[PDB]
Amino acid sequence: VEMVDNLRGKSGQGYYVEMTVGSPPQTLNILVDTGSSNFAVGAAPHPFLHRYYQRQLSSTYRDLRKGVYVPYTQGKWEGELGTDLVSIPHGPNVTVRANIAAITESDKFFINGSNWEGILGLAYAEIARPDDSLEPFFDSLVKQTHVPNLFSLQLCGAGASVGGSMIIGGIDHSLYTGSLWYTPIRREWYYEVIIVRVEINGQDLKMDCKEYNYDKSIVDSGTTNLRLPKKVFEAAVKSIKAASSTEKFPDGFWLGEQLVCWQAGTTPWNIFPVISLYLMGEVTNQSFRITILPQQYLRPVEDVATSQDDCYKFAISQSSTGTVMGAVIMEGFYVVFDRARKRIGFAVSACHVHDEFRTAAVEGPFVTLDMEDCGYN
Ligand SMILES: CC(=O)N[C@@H](Cc1ccccc1)[C@H](O)CN[C@H]1CC(C)(C)Cc2nn(CC(C)(C)C)cc21
């Protein structure tokens, strides 16, 4: 399909897809964000924008006469709502009319050299700003075209520059191997899921499973790290420390605020454990596990200045807002957002993570006869 390899990015800075807005079409790169539900594009000059949406140049622009403000984990923006024609040159061969927030002010949102100038929130209307009557893009796309109500993401961030695919309307079987395991979307707002068990080096963290979903867990392509509620993050760090205790790192490293560096080519991958996240299955008390390697959770930081070394930031961090399965954990899986059947599917992706000793995996089933719902509330 002409859709394969339509994502690009820089590591830690999100993955983006080419879109056009307006008529005649204005080309913009747009961040793919399953962690939010607003379509917003820079629409005035900013030191970090290479280009921006010029509403005056679009004869199909319609102004909704309504402001909007979106704060995310750290960045935020404000702008003006309207609608316009939108296309995805390397996606489905359609043009739809969609709501678009024209960002006119922002703080800590745009990133210097990221190459994107806007954001596609792919989650549900329940969390759109200003409220749930602002129809999200994907809903408009499905309503206006015959595109099936499903999209999949293969995020590779493999060899700063990263790639992948966003396949809309379909499952591309050349993008994964083995089977697809499905977890139910628990509620349609974020892509909310349920983690039932966490292991490090195969050792269970032995917590009540509701702690892992305090107070929701989501799948979030717009967030880099695996973020964990404090109690789970502390338990996990203790475990990973213990597994890797042949070397000691500063506390700043574990807090995500300092790099760790090894002379180029010598990163000791084998001293770090794998992490397994077990997700609720489609049948009662069954689960499957996705297993992640330290090549995924030690994120490389490209910097020519430090390049006699390879240097890494620890990409597991504390959350006061629930577990966030960010790009770290999506990378090397093919993740299918099957909105039509209210589930998300995971399979090992054609760009999987891989070492001569260990491989990321998606595998099941696992059973737990213990009858506790792991949903927080
Ligand atoms: C790290 C981050 O904030 N990512 C957001 C996307 C983004 C991409 C580039 C620059 C800045 C922001 C992504 O949407 C975050 N997803 C969730 C992460 C949460 C649940 C911990 C907090 C939150 N707030 N929002 C905003 C809203 C409440 C309006 C849905 C989205 C989210």
Q: Does residue 204 carry a catalytic annotation?
A: no
Does the residue 67 lie in any domain? yes
Does the residue 124 lie in any domain? yes
Residues 6+ apart with CB under 8 A from 31: 14, 15, 16, 114, 116, 118, 119, 120, 222
Q: Answer yes or no: do 87 and 186 share one domain.
A: no
* Separation between Cα atoms, residue 234 and residue 197, nearest integer Å: 15
**Which of 147, 163, 192 is at the close of a domain?**
147
Does the residue 220 lie in any domain? yes
What's the structural domain count of the chain? 2
Report in angstroms the alpha-carbon separations of 2 from 19, 90, 140: 14, 6, 22
Looking at the chain, how many residues does it have?
377
Does the residue 5 lie in any domain? no
Residues 6+ apart with CB under 8 A from 359: 293, 348, 352, 353
| Resolution of the experimental model, in Å, one decimal | 1.8
* Separation between Cα atoms, residue 352 and residue 175, nearest integer Å: 10
* Separation between Cα atoms, residue 344 and residue 330, nearest integer Å: 12
Q: Answer yes or no: do 183 and 223 share one domain.
A: yes
Ligand 1 neighbour 217 (Cβ under 6 A): no
Domain of 234, CATH number, reads 2.40.70.10
Does the residue 4 lie in any domain? no
Does the residue 349 lie in any domain? yes
Q: Answer yes or no: do 254 and 278 share one domain.
A: yes
Ligand 1 neighbour 1 (Cβ under 6 A): no
Q: Answer yes or no: do 127 and 179 share one domain.
A: no
Does the residue 1 lie in any domain? no
Spot the catalytic one: 33, 84, 310, 338.
Answer: 33
Q: What ligand 1 atom has the least distance to the C-alpha of 114? A: 9
Contact 259/184 with Cβ under 8 angstroms? no
**What kind of experiment solved this structure?**
X-ray
The domain of 138 spans 15-147
Q: Answer yes or no: do 143 and 40 share one domain.
A: yes
Q: Answer yes or no: do 26 and 97 share one domain.
A: yes
* Separation between Cα atoms, residue 335 and residue 332, nearest integer Å: 9
**Coil, helix or strand for 308?**
coil
Q: Is the peptide bond before 130 cis (omega within 30 degrees of 0)?
A: yes
Q: Does residue 220 carry a catalytic annotation?
A: yes
